[PDB]
């Protein structure tokens, strides 16, 4: 009997996690209903903060561990795995990305996605069934071609030897050799947020469009964009597998090409990928009511992806759907409210931020028992 | 069908009390189009209640010359109501702060002739009923000006009309209202008044009210010594106390000689507006009220509706400006000043948005059974 709400935002970036968020909205509500039957369900569009929103859902942990980083160091990493140990959640950025690579040393002819393909391999170690993998951030433009290294393949030189890390590697890659390739990995279902339609060459592809932001010169991206033409030649030659064509086998430097072609991942919306694993539907199917929300503070990526999927679903059981969105200044949603909010360099405004979700949420609530009573 | 009241004061420096009603109306109207919408666009006696009141009652904006505070020419206004038994005066419209540069401040010399002028014109088109608030003045006189404007005769020991100023009144030695306006007993006259302080001492006009007036502290003295003499004279020759009121300090000094020339009452400015535009009732027979206002400082309005709303157990909403009680929800919207081009414009846009989802808001709560 009970009213049935489920609580399902996305984070507020720069300042409050999905959880923490869906905390303070709970707080709110509790206010005007205290025995109402609350389902907090943090969720993630596949970017930054998947892996902790994933752990939180599914009673999983943070796994600790120390790879080889973008320029070839050692770095510590992290992989998160779901409470049943049947999934794992890697974010790339945490051993390949842009943020591991003082401004001062982007070389994104050296990069390399190594350490992606160990947190893989631990993954796979743990005997998961099923891997998410966020790809966005990277430093890297090597193709995943360090990446499936570390995991087994052997990716030659026109003299047998191994290629250089980095981009610069891939240029002289002759054979593709897969009989050392983790066996694990076919059997493994493996899905990448992946957001973007660019192939993996071309004048939107990956080097041309994400190339410069990891540094690239204007020549460097021509030499690199002419590396991933052969790759993917040797790719439909040595594993038999068409990447040219790939939409999104453009993404983290080719990273989706490699991760389609040799792991047999899928490539889907991260939010997607998000809402079936935590399985979204089947605790909305139930609701009465259904709130959600996103905090972005830079407003070329203010993209409701979270509500906007979180309403796709409702809509099909009609539920209504509220949102609660923070901004810097102020679609299948019934309403939605704003929340003014703050990069967290003070942590008193990560406190304000709370409050201010909370006390949003606590009026809509009121209104919606007002509303009732009409 | 669904009846709705909208009763907001206005946004400081931006919407108008009618334009957040219209603002949160249009919102409504696209999640209910077909309710009932009725705008009563609020005010407390202060700025604006004059232009609340004309549209709240579908009568209109009188521009008339009148006397300043330093005796120039100024274009006054004032409301008459829509039936014409009502007039609604703003005191500052006449002899206000506004009139008065900052340089040339000085509560010695400020008249308050020029209310009494517009008083006078409003009881020329034969209204009842007067609504005045006397905030924002520039005078320290006690009123003494207007009277004298209405035909009280206020001369010193040689029967000399007084001078214009509170400066006048140290030489006052007489009060006759035999040439005081006839018309005035006759009339309902109610005075927006939310200060408790009388006319003279510590807590009086001039101490309190002088020094964003100009009033220096010798001055402060002056004026004060000036209107305690008043105040007995009041008493000697109106045989009214006026040295008790509550009240008689407001507008330096004015609300006395409102109560004791003209007959008239004080009262809470939201009471008295309350009133006049039959809130009660209004919201007696709505299903639902929505209220606000908006502030650019650190709100007797939407607490005034939403007190006499929840006496009738009907959800209250605000919907509440700004730059950075008894009500169910509210919520925010932020503006800016209307200086900048887009401001105004930004501002409707804003709240009617915030109207929309709190609709929307309250008809998904209808279908949560
Ligand atoms: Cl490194």
Excluded at 145 to 152: K, P, R
Excluded at 326 to 352: M, P, Q, R, W
Aim: glycine share 12%; proline share 3%.
């Amino acid at each position: 009997n009970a009213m049935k709400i489920v609580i399902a935002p996305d984070s507020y970036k720069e300042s409050l996690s999905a959880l923490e968020v869906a905390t303070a909205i709970e707080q709110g509500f509790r206010e005007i209903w205290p025995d109402a039957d609350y389902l907090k369900l943090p969720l993630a569009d596949g970017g930054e903060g998947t892996v902790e929103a994933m752990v939180e859902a599914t009673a999983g942990r943070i796994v600790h561990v120390e790879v080889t980083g973008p320029l070839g160091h050692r770095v510590n990493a992290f992989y998160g795995l779901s409470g049943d140990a049947r999934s794992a959640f890697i974010e790339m950025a945490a051993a390949s990305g842009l943020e591991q690579v003082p401004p001062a040393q982007r070389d994104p002819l050296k990069t390399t996605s190594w350490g992606t393909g160990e947190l893989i391999r631990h993954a796979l170690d743990a005997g998961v069934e099923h891997i998410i993998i966020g790809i966005g951030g990277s430093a890297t433009n090597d193709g995943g071609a360090g990446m499936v290294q570390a995991l087994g393949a052997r990716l030659r030189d026109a003299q047998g030897n191994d290629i250089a890390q980095g981009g610069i590697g891939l240029e002289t890659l002759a054979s593709i050799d897969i009989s050392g390739l983790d066996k694990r990995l076919s059997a493994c279902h493996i899905e990448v947020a992946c957001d973007v339609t660019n192939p993996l060459t071309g004048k939107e592809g990956a080097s041309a469009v994400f190339g410069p932001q990891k540094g690239a010169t204007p020549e460097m991206i021509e030499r690199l964009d002419t590396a991933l033409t052969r790759y993917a030649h040797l790719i439909a030659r040595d594993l038999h597998v068409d990447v040219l064509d790939l939409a999104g086998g453009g993404a983290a430097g080719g990273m989706g090409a490699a991760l389609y072609a040799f792991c047999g991942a899928q490539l889907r919306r991260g939010i997607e990928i998000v809402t079936d694993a935590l399985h979204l539907e089947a605790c909305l199917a139930d609701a009465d009511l259904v709130i959600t929300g996103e905090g972005r503070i830079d407003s070329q990526t203010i993209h409701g992806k979270v509500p906007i999927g979180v309403a796709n679903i409702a809509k099909r059981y009609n539920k209504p759907v509220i949102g609660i969105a923070g901004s810097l200044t102020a679609h299948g949603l019934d309403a939605v409210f704003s929340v003014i909010y703050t990069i967290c360099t003070l942590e008193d405004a990560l406190k304000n931020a709370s409050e201010n979700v909370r006390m949003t949420a606590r009026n809509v609530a009121a209104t919606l028992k007002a509303g009732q009573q009409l």
